[model samples]
Each structure stands twice: as C-alpha cells, then as structure tokens.
Target: MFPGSVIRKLSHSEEVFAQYEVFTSMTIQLRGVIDVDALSDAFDALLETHPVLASHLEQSSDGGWNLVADDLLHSGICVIDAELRLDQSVSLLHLQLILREGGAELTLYLHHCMADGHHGAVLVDELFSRYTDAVTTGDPGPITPQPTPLSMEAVLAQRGIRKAERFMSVMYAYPGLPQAVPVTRLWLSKQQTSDLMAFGREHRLSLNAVVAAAILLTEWQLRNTPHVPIPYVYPVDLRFVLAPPVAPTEATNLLGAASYLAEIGPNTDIVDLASDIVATLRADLANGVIQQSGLHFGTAFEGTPPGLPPLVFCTDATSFPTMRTPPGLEIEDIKGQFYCSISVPLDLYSCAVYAGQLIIEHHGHIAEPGKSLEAIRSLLCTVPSEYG
Candidate 1:
C-alpha cells in the first residue's frame, strides 16, 4: 500500500502530461571504469533527500491521479543485462545501469506525471553527486527530504487565481491521438552556440525567443504558407513566481504554455517574431496568465481529445545539468527525449536544446522529413551570422 501523505491531487495541467501514460527518460553515456553498487546506493540516497523521486502514482476511484510514496526501502536500480523498457507498471523511478567492458550507460526514466525536465535534471545531479561520495568515502551521505510540494491549483488559489469557467470552447477537438514522427538532431559547435547566445544578448532577446523565431520561420517556409498568423506553442516554467518559489528538486509539472497566432508573411522579420514572443511571454508572466494557463487550458481541452496543435513545441534544457560524472568515470555524452507513445499522435514542429545542441526532434506532417530538416538547419545556421 502507498505510505506517504496524499500530498494533493494532480492539477488539470499535470493530468495532461500523463495522457499517454508513459515515462520520460534521460540517458547518459559513461567512459572509464565504474562501480555499479555505489551507483545504486546513490539512488537510494536520493530517495531520502527527494521524496518526489520516491513516489509511485495511484489513481483515485474518482479517476484523479495521486502521488503516493512507496514504502520499499530500495528504489529499484537495475543492472541491465537485457533489454528493459523500465515499464511504468514496475515503478515510477527506474534507474538502469548498463555495464559493458570499457564503461557503462545510465538511463533514468521517471513518470511524466510526476516530473518535468527541471525536476529530472535535479534528480540526476544528485544521483551523480551521491555516487561520487559513495565511492570516495563509502558514504552516500544523509539527505533529508524536503516538505511535500503544494499542487498548482493550490498555489494559484492561495494567490487568488481560483478555477474559472472553461477557457476554450468544447468545439476545440484534438485532430487525433499523437503519432510518432521522425526526429532530426543538430549538434551546434561551441562557437555556434556561443554566437547564438551572444546574438540574443545583443538583440535584447532571450535565447528561447531566438530559437522560437527560427522554428517559426522554418515552419512557414515548409508549409509555403504566408500572409497568415502562424501558430506557435512553447512551455514557460512557473517556479520563479510562486509565493515561496518551488525548488527544482521538488518533482512536479509546473509548466505553462506561452502560445499565440502571429502573422509571419514572406517579408516578415525573424527579429520581430522573436521580440513578439519575448514581449507576449513577459506580459503573460506579469499578468499571471501563465499561472492560469494550465487550469484554463486543462479544463478547456479536457474531454476534447488527446493531441497537440500543429505548431512549434520547444523545450530548452541548455541551462540544466549536462555533465556530472562519478569518480573514476568520465562522461562521454548526455542526451534526453520527451518521448511520445504511439497511441498519442504527434506531427508538430518540436525542438529540444540539450547540452548546447539545437535538436529538431519532431515536426508537422506538412513537409517532407528531408525538406524539414534542411529548412531547420538553414535557419539555425544563419542565426549567428545573419541575425546579428
């Protein structure tokens, strides 16, 4: 049976993340010798400090999702000798260490309903820290769990933004379940990444806005559609504005959408689009619109269908932890995916920047995969030199 306090029910927005009922994973490649036992122990230490990592989900009789702490002492850390999916039914926190001759690979899969990118990174950072400690001093160290996090609805309610009537009309039905589209990855050179960032600073735009502009431009060219308001959707992290401010260690979905339909004709300026996104998001955050988005959209889209709009979905993790190797182990590479299940159809332009690389892992059906890849590559390549 579940043991911890029923912290609170999942927010409507939180429920959307669980729509496919799949786990989102972070994969890392390690070089050099390693200790498997210590790695497992490190995860054990994590549960002590981060109760969210120790949680397994339970569905109430009313069909609401609840985060219940597992009573088991050791959260399973498997030594993968065979193919493993780390299926959701087994546990919420699945750590698999694949041991090979030269080194090992570590994959941490957490249920999306419980954690987002920030939370996942926080968990991984701690895992590596504990693993190092375990090997260096035979001590995983003591980690006291933080107090349970309050629900999004609760956070907003306390701020005087209570549930309201459905935001979007019921007529807004998802086209269909999300489908798996082909993914294209782009590795930006150190100089290219630096230039992009510098360009943003010079233009008074955040890196996110710059990337969003590039994605929108690529989509417009691929669709060959101009003189129309191109639709775009991206998530805005809400932890910064919470009353006490939520910690990244507290695994929960605090994501809010910054979506809009803007005109982007052939003569349209990319900087204009970037500036608009920055301004719109700033206004949304200032007016508390971002805080209200999940509940509003969650209720509006509830029962409509399970699908995402045919637009740009960008998730930037460039600021998150990239390299934290345990003692005696060198990190070769780190990569992650916001995986989509086959049951959930997805054919939207999506980009995820991880470890300084701009990746166009998903896209809409309007363009050929080759053509879409070319368009995205061209737009990003021009950003550093042309945007400046």
Candidate 2:
C-alpha cells in the first residue's frame, strides 16, 4: 500500500460533484513506437508520488463523498487493445495507451469530480516526462509527496466569501441529465493564430479576451440581432489570482466564471467589445465576485438546465504544454478532444492549438449541426486580423 493511503472528506466544491458523472479526456497521437511496459512502470511510479491518481470515490453513510487511496493495485494502469473508452461508473482515473502499426496514441480519462482542465494538463505533461525519463535515462523523474488537494470553495471561505446556500438550493433544486447534441470542429492556420495573438497584444488584450470578443462579434453578425443585449460567459482559471494561488498541477477542480452582457450594433467595434469582457472579469476579480463564484458554482451539485445563460461555455487551453512529446515519439496531431457527458447546461466551446494551427470545437445540441457549424465558423472567421 502507498504511504499516504488515507481517506478524506470532499470539500464543498467536491461534495456537489456527486451529480456530475462527466468524464473529460485528452487524446494524443504519436508518430513513433512506444514501449508499453516502460510506460506502465512509469505510471506505477506516478501512483506512488501522486496518490490521488490511485484513489477512488465512496459514498459516506450520511451521503457525502470521500476519496479513499487504499486500493492502488486493485486497478492497475489501464492498457487497452482498442480505442480508449470513458466509463463513469468507475471511480479511479484511467490512462490508456493504444498501439498502432507505426505509432501509438495515449489517452487519459479523468473524472470531472477530480480536477479541471489545468490539472489534467499537468497530469498528462508529468506522465510524458516520466515515460521519457524511464525509457531514455532509467530515471522515473521527481517523486515528491503531493499535498492534500484544496477546494476552491474552502479557499474562498477563508477569504470571507461564503457559499450562496440559498442560491445553491435554487440552482440545484431538481437537476437532470444534460441532453446530447451536435458537434462541429474548426481551425485556423498557424500563421492566422499567430496573427490573432499579435492582434490581441497590439490591442492590450489577452488572446482569451480576443476570442471572447470574436464570439460576440460573430453572434451579432450571424443572428443579425443588432442593438440587443447578448451575454458572453466563460470559466476563468482561478489559479492565477487566488490568494496564495493554487498551482496548475494541484489536482483539484479550481475554476471561476466570468459573464458579461453587451448590446452590439452592426458597426460595434470588436476590440471595444473584447475590452469590455476583459474589464468585467478584472472588476469581478478585484471585487471578490470571482471568488464567490468559485465558492457557489464551483461547488454546485445541481444538474444544469438545457441551454443555460451566457449560452457559451468556452475554455482556452492554448497555453497548456499539452503538445509536448517524449524524446523518441513524434506528435502527429491532437486527433480531437472534448467532454462527452449526459448533462450539459449548453453547447461546449473550447479552443486549443496544435502544430501551429488554432483548433476550435463546438459541441452543440441543436437540430441542424451544419447550420450551427456554419454560424460558428462565420462568427470566428469574421474577426478582422488587423485591429485598427
């Protein structure tokens, strides 16, 4: 048994996770052969250092969640013969290496209850690092003891931001499973992505802000709903500004939301709209609203209604070191990635980059997938490259 095999109660953020059976995944395509045995050994080493990976969730007598780490060897690291499958019934994290004729693909499925995208990125990067070290140098990388993961809810409570229990009661009164919907994928060339980044810099805005603005502009253009208020909503990574900020690899769900409502005309300036989004987020962070959101929504256990507010749930993971590969393996491409679940409040919009190309995926649950795709494509492509 691992040394730190102790059971701990789920924090406020973790408690409401009981209703969320969504399992998120990252799939990487490699162009070279991989040593499965070496990789398996590396995963074993990771279990020893990061005990959370080997833990499982249990329902306490009183109906709360508990993470128990006493069964590391019960479910060894998953190595599959076919494509990776996401199973929610299982409580442990899963890592699958799918072998191909001349190359391979590695997929990691993490329970949404365990962590957010940032934490998932950290875990993948560490796995690759350990695999490389083992196959190339016979070392298993650093094995420091991982600290007990903290909940964003508890952290905010310490700062005087309490959970909106009343609001939570209303929000989670009767949650239902998310309905499945159509999905569309889009991308921009590396040059275009770079141009967009430069455009953001030139206008004193972050790439995420720029993307949000583009989304707003696209909606205005597509819907022809000029002069009507539209709300843009997205999740903000709290690791950056939380007091004594949490590290990206802390292995917990750490997220806050940012929402803005704006009425744009046909000639409304994209930069100005994007700037508003950024300003609203900044103000929220400064006023402790973001922290409170982390406490309320981050710990929310209710099932989300169909097509919830803000209407766009976007995540910008372009900064993640997810594209890195081991020494011998070459990255073919990030075949595709998204959260497939039974319940989602609305369509999912996520952005990432691979091999110098900007990838955008929209998981929409509407009647016409083509129309929705075209709408999204037009909205994204209409953003002017040069912000004058």
Candidate 3:
C-alpha cells in the first residue's frame, strides 16, 4: 500500500459497503438562491473538515482495500452541474448541485463506508453551515480537519465491548421470481403523520417502533404465516447513544444490528406488537448487544446466514429538524433515497419523516406491492381505536 500521509485500510464491515459500493443518496430541494462557486468552495471546506471524504478507495495488491489519498488528497471535482449519478466509483463522496429557475436541487452521493443514515444528516448540516458562511463572508472559514474515522471495532473496544454477536439465526429472505421486486413508496400526509405521531405517543412508542409494527403486520397480513413469528433484523444507530457520543460530523458507520422475532398471531394488535418490538430492542440495548453488533464484520464470509426470510426494517432513526439556511436559501424538503438491484434478492422497509410526512420505502422481492403499502399506510395513518 502506498502511504504518503493519508493511507488507511477499510475495516471488515467497511469492505462490505465498498465491495457492493453501497452509495447512500440524499437530496435537498430548496426555494432560494445558491451560488455554485460558493457551494463549490463549501464542498472543499467540508472535505477538509472530514478527510475521509477527501480520499478514494483502491484494491490492494493483497486484494484488500487501501483508502489512499494524494498530497492534498482531493479528486479536484467537488460539485457537478448535472443529475446525481451514484455509480460504482471508488470515490468516497460525490456532490451534484443543479441550479433551477427559482431554486436548486442538491444531491450528495456518499459511500456507506464513509457514513451511515445518521452520519448522512451530519454531512448535510456541515455542508450548509459552511456554504452559508462562504456566501455571506468571503471565505468558508478555517476548519479543524477531523481525523479519518476509526473502525467500528475500535469505537466499541474503547468502551470494553469487543465481541460482535447477533441472536438472529435467520437471514431475511425475499421470495420472488428472479428477485425482480418493485420499489414501492407510501407517503403519509401532514395530518396522517401527525396522527401517527400522536398515536405512537399515546402508546409510548417511537415512530420507528410503530413502523416496524406496521410492517410486521403487513407481512403477516399479506403472507399470513399464522402461528409462527416473522423474524426480522434491525439496525441501531450508536452515535448519540454511545458513552461520550460520536459526533455526526465523524464520517463512519456507527450502526449495529439488532434482530427480533415478531409474534404475528391472528389476534396480535399493532400496538401490542410495537410494544414488544420496543421491549425486545430495549433488552438488547441494555445488554450492549447492539453496540458491538458489527465488531466482527471484517471477517471473510461464506454463503448467507441461516434462517427464515425475515423482514428487514430500517429508518433514519433521527429525523432532522428544520434546517437553518442563510437568507434567500429556504429549504423546502429533504429526503434520502434507497436503491436496490434485481440482481440480488432483498426485502427492505425504510421509514422516514420529511416535511411533516411519514414516508415508507418497501424495496426487494415484494409480493403484493399495493396491499403491502396500503396495509402499512392504514396502520400508521389511522387512529388506534378505529382500527381496533
């Protein structure tokens, strides 16, 4: 490996993201003015702030990955003036700023190795922070370059949690011909979102819990795997929950896997299932199982892990507050997109909140795309008493 001040290898977990090029796509639609040059300068400042984004990947001679960088460690291209292209490139990050008539659409495509869903929000906040500064002041201001993030193993080891274990004996399986699943989305209106939020509060449930319950019920309703529970996997974001808490600006995957078995008996109410979901995750969190879930991710893998085709439920976990932009740069909406390929079979459900709307994305080998979304929509949007 070529070492010239900035050279580090990807961890086992990081390699999986790079191997598949798991690019996380984020888009922000604004209703204000944005100078490209200012945005470009901001990107440089942002990259300087997080050096991980300043570097790219290369396959080592030993077939491992080395995150090598140039002297200054930059690709010389920060912002592109076109549509977002989340290709299988070695670059850790990509920014596209397309100016429109009144406002602009800015999309940031980042390799998952550099950041997880929570980290993605941090990236946007930092970029806007400097972009506003660059436009108002002549410079983007000096940045204290953040060190390239440490591996998840190292992050957890410091806290005395070194073992990675998952109670999940079953890998989620999506059954469909050729795995050609349709990507279905269900967006809850502001009123519906409000109702869902209110309902979750009434039942002492988080939105994540409610969504997981809804999806579990959706799977049960569609497939009706009666008497048996639907096994599922969940990702836990460990940024704020960690002891000292990792900063959002730190570009690294801080997600840990937590598995659950959803009891889907005929009389299983969503509120009950959601309550069970919380208790199960709470127990895992109490035991520190989730924090070290990815500690052994770098080990070479074989075929798939064993078990039933479980439901995979993920979310932003931390829904962002209204962004504070500079004058004339009003942020209208913000959304994170999920992309899946037919090449591999997958069954994923992602829940998010934006512009007072609760959004759910069901991707993978979907059986009844319409009913699935509707079942989830009905559960989250409607009041608890009415459904019961």
Candidate 4:
C-alpha cells in the first residue's frame, strides 16, 4: 500500500475507465424516511475504509494520467423526481434520495474506478452496516483507513514491464453498450441450482468455468456445429492474485479481461470442458495473460485470437453481497444499472449469485439472449452430460 495523497499514474485500463466514467449504480426503495444523520455518518464511514473513494483522475505532469486522492466530494442527494422513476439514468454518476408519504427511494452510485461489482458490493455492505449501526445507536462502526494501493500499471511497472501504447482518443470511435435495453435476466430453479452445485462439488468444477463452458457450448449449439473455435472473454479481478495480494479496497481497479479459447469436443462433455476451462484460466494466470489485458488496453481488442469468430462470447460473473436494509427500513425493491458510454463489439453476459440464487443476465446477444440463456440453464441443471 502507498500513501493516499501520493499521485499515482493511472493504469492503461484506468485511463479508459476514466474516459467512460462508468458506474455500477443502484436505487433502492425503502419503507422509512432516510435519516439524514445516519446516512451522513455512514457515508463518512464508507470513505474511511479506502482512500481511493476520495480520489479522481487528473492529467499527469507528462501527457499520461494520475489518480490523485483528496477528500470525499460529489453532488449531494436530491429529493426531486421523488415519485417518478429514473430508470434511464444515463447521466454522470450521482446519488439521490426521494421520499414519499411513508417510503423513500435512494440511488447509490459508485464509480467504476472506485469499485467494480465486487468492490462496490463491499462498499455497499459496509455503508449499510454503518447506516444500520448509526441509525440505531448513533455510531456507524469502528473504522480504519487501509493503506493506499498501487494501480495495475504501477504494479506492472514495478515488475519491469514496458509502458504500453495508447490511443489519443477513444470516445470518437467508441461502440457503446445498449443503455435502454436492460439485460434479459434468467435464473435457475432452486432444485436445478442445487443439482448444479452438487454436480460441481462432485466434479470439482468451478461455477465460473462451468458457466463459460455452458455459454461456449450453447454458442456453438446455435451454429449447428459440435466443434468450432470459441472464445469466452470476461474481466478477471486481480486483487488477491498478486504477489502480496492487493486488498479489497486498495486500488482503483485491479482487473484484466481473460480471453479464453475454449476447447469443446464432439462429445461435448460439460464436466471435461469446464475442467479444461478452469485449467486454461490457471495456465493463463501462470503466463500473465490476464495482466496483459490491463497493460495493453489501447490495442487489447485490436486483434482476435487466431481462428476465433469475430463476434465472441463475453461474460462477467461478479458475486454481489446480499443487501440487508437498516433497522426500521424495509427494502421494497432494488433497481440496478450500469452507467457508461463505450463501444462494445461483442454482447456481454453478466452473472451474479445473489439471494441464494444464480442469476445470468445479458443484454440481447448475437446468438440470441433468451435461447442462449435457456440452453445454458438447461446444461447447468443437467449433470455432467455428453450432449453432442
């Protein structure tokens, strides 16, 4: 960990992230009026956990960029549009709270730089825990400032990697993800999910690998082929995968996209395929394939791996902490969205295990969203099968 106030160079991915200014934002409907005292205190406690929360990007002395830390700053929550739904919130990240006669809806916005779904969930959990404590007893919780951590680029540099190339402008040529169309959400039935879990335990297969394998299988199934070059691309968090293992709240983003060239056989054994997927991921980690994505953000997507289709399958499985409301506040509903502007050539699937269920969500994909997810769901439910 480094000093909070020390200016650090932005990782290549961090530069693009700043350009996109994406956020994992959510609005929750609750039963009681938000206690301003409690909310304020909880926000303070949230800031105390990590200095990155108080940081923003700035152009460095050179032409590069720096993530500098200072103080917690942002537009305060407003009460207007109290009743109306801001479902299509595409604005820059902002927080807001609205109250009606007996209930309120508060929107929470965490910048992509500060938090991905994984890190953001930690912040969300911490904030709520603090809020619960403060609202009940006027004290949020015991807090300690974690040491500021290094960026992905900074870490790579320390390891003697050359600074990667960069494009001057990206927004001019960006292909943004669909904002209006929400991801088509699909879930496994409790019984099916249970069977899948048991199957995974029996086979020693990881949920991540199986999901990707299922998607690859489903992708090829749509193409009327049992064998084809398949690529499953998704972001991998590097927080705990490093030498010293960066802390949860340490850096802005420690992530890299893993483009796995999946191998499927004519038998289409889900267990073998998933096991292979897991092994490939481990092999890539050993060879620094994951960290390469973070370094070469400029030309990372410039070329596809040999023989893979132009339109590949991309999926991100970010496990989110189950949210618990503060005392006296019953969470009525929680609506979440990703706020950003960037071009994505490939349709992406985002999976999360929340509330004891696995949710697979995708904004309409190339091979078709409904059918693909249903197929994946069915494959997961079926025990290690050979459906060629």
lDDT of 2: 0.63
2 or 3: which has the higher TM-score? 3
lDDT of each: 0.63, 0.63, 0.67, 0.60
Model 3, span 253-328: residue lDDT tens: 7777667766687778878888987897789878866765553221211112455544455553547675557788
Misplaced by over 4 Å in model 1 are 1-8, 86-89, 164-182, 295-309, 347-360, 363-371, 386-388
Q: What is the C-alpha lDDT profile of model 4 across 12-112, one tens digit per residue?
A: 65665555445567767778768876777777776766655565556666766666655555523455432322221222234567777677777777666
Task: Enumerate residue pairs that collide in model 3.
Answer: 12-298, 170-307, 173-309
Best by lDDT: 3
For 129-233, candidate 1 gives per-residue lDDT tens digits of 888888886898787877665556656776766651222331243212323334556566667677777777888886667777877787777665555445555
In order of appearance, the predictions have TM-scores of 0.83, 0.83, 0.85, 0.75
Error of 3 at 211 (Å): 1.6
For candidate 3, the per-residue lDDT at 338 reads 43
**Clashes per candidate (backbone, < 3 Å):** 6, 4, 3, 3
**Candidate 2: lDDT of 154?**
58
TM-score winner between candidates 3 and 4:
3
